Design a protein around this ligand. Structure first.
Ligand SMILES: [Mg+2]
Ligand SMILES: [Mg+2]
Ligand SMILES: [Mg+2]
Ligand SMILES: [Mg+2]
Ligand SMILES: [Mg+2]
Ligand SMILES: [Mg+2]
Ligand SMILES: [Mg+2]
Ligand SMILES: [Mg+2]
Ligand SMILES: [Mg+2]
Ligand SMILES: [Mg+2]
Ligand SMILES: [Mg+2]
Ligand SMILES: [Mg+2]
Ligand SMILES: [Mg+2]
Ligand SMILES: [Mg+2]
Ligand SMILES: [Mg+2]
Ligand SMILES: [Mg+2]
Ligand SMILES: [Mg+2]
Ligand SMILES: [Mg+2]
Ligand SMILES: [Mg+2]
Ligand SMILES: [Mg+2]
Ligand SMILES: [Mg+2]
Ligand SMILES: [Mg+2]
Ligand SMILES: [Mg+2]
Ligand SMILES: [Mg+2]
Ligand SMILES: [Mg+2]
Ligand SMILES: [Mg+2]
Ligand SMILES: [Mg+2]
Ligand SMILES: [Mg+2]
Ligand SMILES: [Mg+2]
Ligand SMILES: [Mg+2]
Ligand SMILES: [Mg+2]
Ligand SMILES: [Mg+2]
Ligand SMILES: [Mg+2]
Ligand SMILES: [Mg+2]
Ligand SMILES: [Mg+2]
Ligand SMILES: [Mg+2]
Ligand SMILES: [Mg+2]
Ligand SMILES: [Mg+2]
Ligand SMILES: [Mg+2]
Ligand SMILES: [Mg+2]
Ligand SMILES: [Mg+2]
Ligand SMILES: [Mg+2]
Ligand SMILES: [Mg+2]
Ligand SMILES: [Mg+2]
Lengths: 87, 14, 206, 41, 97, 26, 149, 46, 122, 179
RNA sequence: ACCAAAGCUAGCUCAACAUACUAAACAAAUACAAAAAUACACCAAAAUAAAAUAAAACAUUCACCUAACAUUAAAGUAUAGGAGAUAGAAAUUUUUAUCCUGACGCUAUAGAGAUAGUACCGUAAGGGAAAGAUGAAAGAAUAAAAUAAAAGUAAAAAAAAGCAAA
RNA sequence: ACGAGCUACCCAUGAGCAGUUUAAAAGAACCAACUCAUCUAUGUGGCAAAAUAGUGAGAAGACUUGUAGGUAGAGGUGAAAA
RNA sequence: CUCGCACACGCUUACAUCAGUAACUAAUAAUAUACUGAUAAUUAACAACCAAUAAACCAAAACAACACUAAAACGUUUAUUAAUUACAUUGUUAACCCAACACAGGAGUGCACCAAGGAAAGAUUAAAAGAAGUAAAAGGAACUCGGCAAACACAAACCCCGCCU
């Protein structure tokens, strides 16, 4: 189950947002920049006895952020589960 | 007068 | 693990925390109190493992070895002398192994027998000149040794094998204690070379 | 000295023995039997 | 009215025990002893009833006067209430007046 | 528990009478 | 340690050291699906994540990466014969995620024995045969078969 | 309109009205606790 | 109404009521609202080396026990300091003014692990 | 080193698992301080293993094989703790002379009873503590009545217990006429 | 024949004596919202008892009414009292040490409320029960023996007409 | 002694009123959520120790409502119904 | 047929898995979220705990441009001190709360009116009387204290009393 990641269920407004509203003429993007927090420092992970997870943190951050960004792009262009993306 | 007598319940052990 | 029993209790040869006892009397019942003659620990002469003779009953005048004693009701039991027949194997369509179980005997119906002349005698406790407190007989005037009985766990000290998790007698009796005035904390710290320079501040106690 | 009645069985029976041939609850209930027996006498 | 179905054990009481043999032995201690002690001193019981008799109100008053200061709180309160009730019943209630 | 022997002995008489009524002897 | 007064800390207090710990830990099989790197302990109510981490790092030398604790509440619903509630004790359950990628699986602590199973089957067959031989003959109709003639 | 549901539970209100600190902050509550202990109550307060 | 016989715990309260289960604190609250943990406050389990320790959790059954003689202050003094003071008195070097060499301590505030204040947990 | 919570693989399915007797206070006293310090952890590992085995037996609905090992280990732990505590008590009586390792006072709370109020560690003195100042250690002029009621109830309970014992001894004496 | 009925015990009550009087447990936490290790304070307080009743009403009065001086007399006296109901002394007298303590008190609708201040009823102060019966042995439950006697039913619904009986 | 967790009134802290006509957020108008309870019929040991169905009034205000606190009986509170 | 999801307050395991229901609970069975036994569970990022001391500070929230009266909660900056060092403690289940009950009643907030929740009928016959609904020849208030209720209407007026909300 995903609850052992750990992940927890919550109920609030489920929004699909690219960085601006749909009326923005810039419906596509170029690049993202993500600054790691103090919680995910290399020294912090080493003190927590985590050396292989330094790259895993970057991988998870990129996989979540870029996927959410591209999904927002696709659903702003009009593609969804039954209208799968063409390009 | 408005005379009203509330009912009395019995103990649950019976 | 000491199971606490209610003050109003009836003893039926069963362990106080046994399934048979819990079936005999549930924790919601308490029965009539039976009279028990006051006999202190210093006046109990019937131990387990000695040969005693039955005085009253269908099998009277017979001698047997004491196996169990119950001091709560002053019960002493002998193996297979005063018997009643009970079935242990019971199913829907089969019965068998009708074992002869043993009925209880009070201290009044049993008196100890000295091993010399094999006659029943009255046992009075005395204090010998050597500092030993041993039973003597008044009918004949002899002493009765303590009937050493094997314990309930079933392991004898004569034949024992030390396992991987058991120490030897040398390691059990090896004395290394150096009686000095240092605490265990300081002992361990100085043994391991732990260094602590700072000290505690002023702490108020109220 | 608490004193209670023990022969109440016989006290009731001495009255009920004369009402055994009656009809209804008068032959069983004691409250209904004393009046019936008195009127019978 | 359900009486017991079994005969009770016969109480084997002896009429020649120590108490039943020595009972009332020194009742004439004064008469036969060059009077020095009344039969009052032979009465064993409560402090306020050693050689005295009275009705319930008098007994309660006497008990309160002697041992009233050593009583317990609840028994003292009950004794006061009983004294008041007996006073009221004896003085204000009755038929012969 | 009512303290008494007369009631018990009278009820023993009545029990014997009931036994006699139920099973008559030869 | 539990049920032991701790020294109050101030600036300059020496390091707190416990030589004989009073904590006792159980290792329990998870009731739900759990990943490979997670290990489930039952710890006393006075145990923290750092206490458990030090416990496993020093006493057992286990490279634990993450600690997550929760408090499970014992049922107070059952009633005694006196209509008094019987409360099961609460307990702290902790999950430790290993660091170096070690895979842990709870072993089967009660493996059945083939010889024991064969002996039990033989005993059952013997009991069935005893019941069959003790069963009355239908052609007799209840007559005791002990008497010869 | 409909009555009988006058008890609306609230732990804060319960502890502030019949709690131990509320009982002991006044001498009358102390006397109440004394009476309950003398009677032998299993629960002196909430 | 509500229950009174059940214990008042953190589960049966509102969000603003969050009571601990009995564990000791490990720090304080810092500047930005975070919890700052002090490494001096956490208990450091001092574990020994059990590799070269030839002792088992159980004893030989055939080994005999001993007569119960609890340790006492007079016995401890006799085993530790009595021979030393006796030797010093025989040699004439016993000094009533200074008894620190025999193991006695004038004050407790000096050393690390103190007895009456009980600065050590265990 | 996560296998120390389990016993040897060859001893998992065994129906009966035997071991030695428990540690005795004299055997603990005979050892030195570091030996006891190491034996504490030696027995602690065994206790953890036994608790794990008991919990797993409960989970599998099977009886624990020879569960007396847990009680033997508990008795050994208690004996070691008692020996360490008696050494500490003797040493602290020798140095300071105080019987109890935690300071305290015999106080009289608002309820009229006498309480062994232990002392807590505070960074500030007693006259500057908000939580401690609002505490009361004295009895008000409405408490002596309840104190007398408590004396009253204890006296009545003791008297009726004495009468109970007297009646029991009587009934036994006239039930057994062996005198 | 069901329903049922009977045990003798737990224990209580009244006194006497008595050390002299808030039992045991107190490892940890307990007047933060009790059982929550840890921060610059506030802590604290006292001011008559009243009335239900009696005087057949009720205003003045109304002993006892949670303050030691006990017993035998003085004495229910002098006195105080809408001089009514009622209240009520003192001066002055008597009181010999210890054991002989148990019960013409009860036996589970009685005796403490108590198997227990627990369930339960109440927000709270507070109120507050009923419940046990075989036997030497149930490690003698293909288990054995005494009543089958209350009311209520079945065995066995009723046949003109009547306080149901004589 | 114990009670303002229901209710009467305050004190802090929050949250709600969609649509339509209107220069209006006007102690305006229609009608929702929401709040009260005019009339009738059932119910009367009932679903209920005050309810259900139909039908009604208010619905940007002297409006409802959540949490916490206060006013305690010779009194509190009250747009007086003792 | 459509009161569903979650959170706050409140109840504490009533939640989940396996097994049993002759009896105990469901106002009846089937069986079981409501009974019995055993074993497990709710893992934090959401929420609780989460600086003081002086000084600059009149200029509302209502899409806030700018205004009205009833004059309006909601904030930064500067300066002095703020242990400094991973991982602290606590709430995480539910068919649930208050009403004596598994009660047609009373319940705050954010979302949508179904993509989620459930079943009015245990099986028959279709007597009277009762409750609810639909329809009705001609009449259209002639019934009744009253046009109360109902109705294919849902309009115009006259008085008494209180200005009006
Ligand atoms: Mg958590
Ligand atoms: Mg109510
Ligand atoms: Mg309650
Ligand atoms: Mg809470
Ligand atoms: Mg909550
Ligand atoms: Mg941290
Ligand atoms: Mg009068
Ligand atoms: Mg009169
Ligand atoms: Mg009058
Ligand atoms: Mg008066
Ligand atoms: Mg005059
Ligand atoms: Mg007059
Ligand atoms: Mg009784
Ligand atoms: Mg009959
Ligand atoms: Mg006739
Ligand atoms: Mg309030
Ligand atoms: Mg309020
Ligand atoms: Mg609007
Ligand atoms: Mg309007
Ligand atoms: Mg309606
Ligand atoms: Mg209609
Ligand atoms: Mg309208
Ligand atoms: Mg209008
Ligand atoms: Mg008046
Ligand atoms: Mg008034
Ligand atoms: Mg008026
Ligand atoms: Mg009027
Ligand atoms: Mg409930
Ligand atoms: Mg059923
Ligand atoms: Mg269940
Ligand atoms: Mg949930
Ligand atoms: Mg039907
Ligand atoms: Mg019809
Ligand atoms: Mg009709
Ligand atoms: Mg119609
Ligand atoms: Mg028509
Ligand atoms: Mg007309
Ligand atoms: Mg007409
Ligand atoms: Mg109309
Ligand atoms: Mg009209
Ligand atoms: Mg019209
Ligand atoms: Mg007119
Ligand atoms: Mg008007
Ligand atoms: Mg106008």
């Amino acid at each position: 189950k995903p609850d052992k990641l750990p992940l927890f269920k919550r109920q609030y407004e489920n929004t699909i947002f690219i960085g601006s509203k749909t009326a923005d003429p810039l419906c596509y993007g170029h690049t993202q920049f993500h600054l790691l927090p103090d919680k995910l420092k290399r020294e912090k992970l080493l003190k927590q006895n985590c050396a292989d997870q330094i790259e895993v943190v970057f991988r998870a951050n990129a996989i979540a952020s870029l996927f959410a960004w591209t999904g927002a792009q696709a659903m702003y262009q009009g593609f969804w589960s039954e209208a799968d993306v063409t390009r | 007068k408005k005379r009203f007598t509330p009912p009395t319940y019995q103990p649950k052990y019976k | 693990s000491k199971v606490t029993l209610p003050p109003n209790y009836r003893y039926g040869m069963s362990r106080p925390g046994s399934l048979s006892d819990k079936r005999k009397n549930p924790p919601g019942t308490r029965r009539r109190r039976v009279p028990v003659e006051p006999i202190s620990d210093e006046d109990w002469h019937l131990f387990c493992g000695d040969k005693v003779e039955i005085l009253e009953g269908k099998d009277a005048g017979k001698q047997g070895k004491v196996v169990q004693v119950i001091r709560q009701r002053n019960w002493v039991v002998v193996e297979g002398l005063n018997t009643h027949y009970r079935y242990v194997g019971k199913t829907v369509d089969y019965r068998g192994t009708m074992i002869p179980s043993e009925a209880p005997l009070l201290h009044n119906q049993v008196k100890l027998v000295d091993p010399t002349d094999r006659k029943p005698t009255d046992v009075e406790w005395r204090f010998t000149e050597a500092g030993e407190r041993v039973r003597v007989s008044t009918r004949s005037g002899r002493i009765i040794p303590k009937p050493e009985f094997p314990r309930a766990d079933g392991i004898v000290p004569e034949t024992w094998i030390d396992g991987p998790k058991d120490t030897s007698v040398e390691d059990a009796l090896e004395k290394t204690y150096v009686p000095r005035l240092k605490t265990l904390e300081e002992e361990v710290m100085e043994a391991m070379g732990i260094q602590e320079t700072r000290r505690h501040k002023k702490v108020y106690w109220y | 000295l608490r004193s209670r009645v023990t022969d109440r069985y016989w006290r009731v029976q001495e009255v009920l023995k004369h009402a055994r041939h009656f009809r209804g609850r008068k032959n069983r209930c004691y409250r209904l039997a004393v009046r019936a027996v008195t009127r019978a006498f | 009215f359900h009486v017991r179905v079994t005969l009770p054990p016969r109480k084997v009481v002896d009429r020649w025990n120590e108490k039943r043999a020595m009972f009332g032995v020194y009742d004439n201690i004064g008469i036969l002893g060059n009077f020095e002690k009344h039969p009052k001193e032979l009465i064993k019981g409560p402090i306020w009833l050693r050689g005295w008799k009275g009705n319930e109100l008098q007994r309660c008053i006497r008990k309160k006067r002697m041992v009233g200061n050593r009583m317990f709180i609840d028994d003292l309160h009950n004794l006061n209430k009983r004294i008041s009730y007996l006073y009221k019943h004896f003085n204000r209630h009755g038929k012969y007046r | 528990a009512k303290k008494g022997f007369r009631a018990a002995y009278r009820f023993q008489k009545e029990l014997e009478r009931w036994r006699l009524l139920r099973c008559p002897p030869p | 340690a539990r049920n032991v007064l701790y020294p109050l800390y101030q600036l300059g207090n020496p390091q707190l050291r416990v030589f004989r710990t009073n904590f006792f830990i159980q290792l329990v099989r998870p009731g739900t699906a759990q990943p490979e790197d997670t290990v489930q302990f039952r710890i006393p109510m006075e145990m923290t994540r750092v206490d458990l981490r030090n416990y496993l790092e020093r006493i057992y030398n286990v490279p634990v990466a993450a600690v997550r604790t929760r408090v499970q509440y014992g049922s107070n619903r059952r009633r005694d014969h006196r209509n008094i509630r019987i409360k099961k004790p609460d307990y702290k359950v902790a999950y430790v995620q290993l660091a170096l990628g070690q895979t842990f699986t709870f072993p089967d602590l009660f493996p059945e024995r083939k010889g024991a199973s064969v002996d039990v089957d033989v005993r059952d067959q013997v009991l069935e045969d005893q019941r069959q031989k003790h069963s009355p003959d239908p052609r007799r109709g209840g007559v005791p078969g002990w008497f010869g003639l | 309109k409909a009555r009988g549901n006058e008890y609306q539970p609230s732990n804060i209100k319960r502890k502030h009205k019949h709690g131990w600190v509320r009982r002991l902050r006044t001498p009358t509550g102390v006397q109440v606790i004394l009476r309950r202990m003398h009677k032998g109550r299993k629960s002196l307060s909430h | 109404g509500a229950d009174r016989m059940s214990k008042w715990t953190s589960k049966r309260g509102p969000r603003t009521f969050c009571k601990g289960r009995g564990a000791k604190g490990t720090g304080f609250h810092g500047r930005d609202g975070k919890f700052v943990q002090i490494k001096e406050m956490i208990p450091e389990l001092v574990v020994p080396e059990l590799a070269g320790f030839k002792l088992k959790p159980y004893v030989n059954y055939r080994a005999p026990e001993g007569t119960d003689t609890p340790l006492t202050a007079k016995q401890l003094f006799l085993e530790t300091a009595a021979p030393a003071i006796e030797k010093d008195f025989k040699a004439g070097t016993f000094d009533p003014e200074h008894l620190e060499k025999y193991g006695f301590e004038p004050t407790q505030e000096g050393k690390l692990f103190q007895l009456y204040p009980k600065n050590f947990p265990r | 080193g996560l296998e120390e919570f389990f016993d040897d693989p060859k001893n998992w399915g065994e129906e009966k698992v035997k071991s030695g007797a428990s540690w005795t206070c004299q055997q603990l006293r005979n050892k030195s301080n570091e030996d006891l310090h190491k034996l504490w952890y030696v027995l602690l590992k065994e206790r953890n293993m036994l608790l794990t085995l008991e919990q797993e037996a409960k989970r599998q609905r099977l009886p624990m094989p020879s569960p007396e090992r847990l009680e033997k280990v508990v008795d050994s732990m208690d004996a070691l703790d008692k020996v360490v505590q008696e050494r500490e008590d003797a040493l602290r009586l020798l140095q300071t002379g105080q019987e109890k390792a935690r300071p305290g006072a015999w106080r009289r709370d608002i309820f009229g009873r006498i309480i062994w109020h232990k002392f807590k560690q505070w960074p500030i003195p007693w006259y500057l503590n908000k939580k401690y100042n609002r505490k009361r250690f004295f009895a008000m002029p409405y408490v002596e009545r309840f104190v007398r009621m408590r004396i009253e109830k204890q006296a009545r309970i003791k008297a009726r217990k004495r009468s109970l014992e007297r009646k029991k001894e009587k009934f036994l004496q006239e039930k057994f006429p062996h005198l």
